[PDB]
């Protein structure tokens, strides 16, 4: 339209940059105050688009979710085409947080083109976004934790106990409850948890003795490797069977034993 702030030379330089990076004829489409943005547009040039459309040059711009999702954008009249490929309540709630410009207008609007008068209901109506968040307990985490504790344990004296103070505060702050949702109803609770010391033992005992946790030719490695299942031979006796700190504490002060070196090193460094 008539109203533009941006000087010509500005525009023309960006337009120039389009020619050279041409892909979908973003060239032509941008020259029509008509612009697209998504992941398949290169980072450089897509930024350039939004610099025009915050300056008032372009006049609609067609995008995918990512724009209003992670980026401030000036919008009034927002438009939506189908429910394809997947539209979710969460995403309707995203776009509905956008439209209308602060203190310039007090409207903004949506338009659903428009395949159903049914599905609009089933987005609008049903409210709730909640954190039903996930557990952090995993096998791999506990291997990482193992080799953390055993890092300064390798030759050192003062450094060991200093580090051991640190690892302490770490692994106590972690696996405290976590007491989420799905977990409470898995026969733990009500509503308590902890427990997880026993899990970490079962894991540990499996993990040192098996033969094919080393590797072609069999364990041993180190010479020890029993003392895992020694802590199972302590706790699981009476279950142990009720504490919150002291038994967690004991678990992490035991803690090598001898777990299998070359292989678990190569686990931790695939994940990094």
């Amino acid at each position: 339209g008539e109203k533009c702030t941006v000087e010509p030379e500005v525009v023309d330089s960006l337009m120039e940059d389009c020619e050279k990076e041409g892909e979908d004829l973003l060239l032509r489409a941008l020259q029509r105050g008509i612009g697209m943005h998504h992941a398949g547009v290169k980072g450089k040039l897509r930024a350039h688009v939004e610099r025009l459309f915050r300056g008032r040059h372009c006049g609609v711009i067609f995008s995918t979710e990512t724009l209003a999702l992670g980026i401030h954008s000036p919008c009034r009249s927002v438009v939506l085409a189908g429910d394809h490929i997947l539209l979710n309540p969460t995403q309707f709630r995203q776009m509905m947080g956008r439209a209308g410009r602060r203190g310039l207008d007090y409207l903004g609007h949506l338009v659903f083109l428009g395949i159903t008068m049914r599905r609009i209901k089933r987005l609008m109506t049903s409210s709730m976004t909640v954190i039903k968040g996930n557990v952090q307990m995993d096998p791999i985490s506990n291997l990482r934790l193992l080799q953390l504790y055993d890092f300064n344990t390798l030759r050192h004296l003062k450094n060991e106990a200093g580090w051991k103070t640190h690892v302490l505060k770490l692994a106590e702050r972690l696996f405290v409850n976590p007491l989420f949702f799905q977990g409470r109803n898995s026969v733990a609770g009500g509503n308590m948890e902890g427990f997880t010391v026993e899990w970490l033992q079962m894991l540990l005992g499996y993990f040192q003795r098996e033969g094919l946790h080393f590797s072609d030719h069999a364990s041993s490695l180190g010479s020890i490797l029993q003392d895992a299942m020694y802590v199972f031979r302590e706790a699981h006796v009476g279950n142990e069977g009720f504490s919150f700190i002291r038994m967690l504490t004991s678990g992490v002060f035991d803690k090598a034993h001898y777990s299998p070196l070359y292989d678990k090193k190569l686990n931790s460094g695939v994940l990094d």
Binding site: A29, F62, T64, C75, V78, V79, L80
Partner: protein, 144 residues
């Protein structure tokens, strides 16, 4: 009330419209398929079914109305857009999820616009347009 009356209105409209195109189709095909049976052999001037048909159904994008996705859509998306402009609610962002979608949309619109540029190379007003500018340029050149 009303909102769904129009919705289901235009949906049912489409479906029965489709059936009607299957009537025109059915009788078109009937002739195409060469039944030789009807032993009149040009002793009657009306053959290949009876009456009454002989209508013309509007084609716009293969039909007008149209359910679902990627045909309905783009045809109207230009006009959706354009009415937010003609209401003078200024700029707007259209959303479609990736990948082929957004490209079909954009492309199709560039097409339509380039189309309408061609129609105005039918050239009356545009003709006088060129006729002017040129004159001015020539005059300026001569003066310089």
């Amino acid at each position: 009330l009303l909102e769904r009356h129009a919705a289901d209105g235009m949906e049912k409209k489409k479906r029965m419209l489709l059936r009607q195109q299957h009537l025109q189709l059915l009788q078109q095909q009937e002739q195409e398929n060469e039944p030789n049976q009807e032993e009149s052999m040009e002793q009657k001037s009306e053959e290949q079914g009876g009456a009454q048909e002989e209508e013309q159904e509007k084609e716009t994008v293969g039909s007008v109305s149209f359910p679902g996705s990627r045909q309905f859509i783009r045809e109207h998306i230009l006009n959706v857009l354009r009415e937010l402009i003609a209401r003078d609610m200024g700029p707007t962002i259209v959303f479609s999820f990736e990948s082929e979608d957004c490209g079909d949309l954009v492309k199709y619109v560039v097409e339509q616009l380039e189309e309408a540029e061609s129609r105005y190379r039918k050239t009356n007003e545009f003709a006088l347009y060129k006729a002017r500018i040129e004159r001015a340029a020539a005059a300026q050149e001569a003066r310089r």
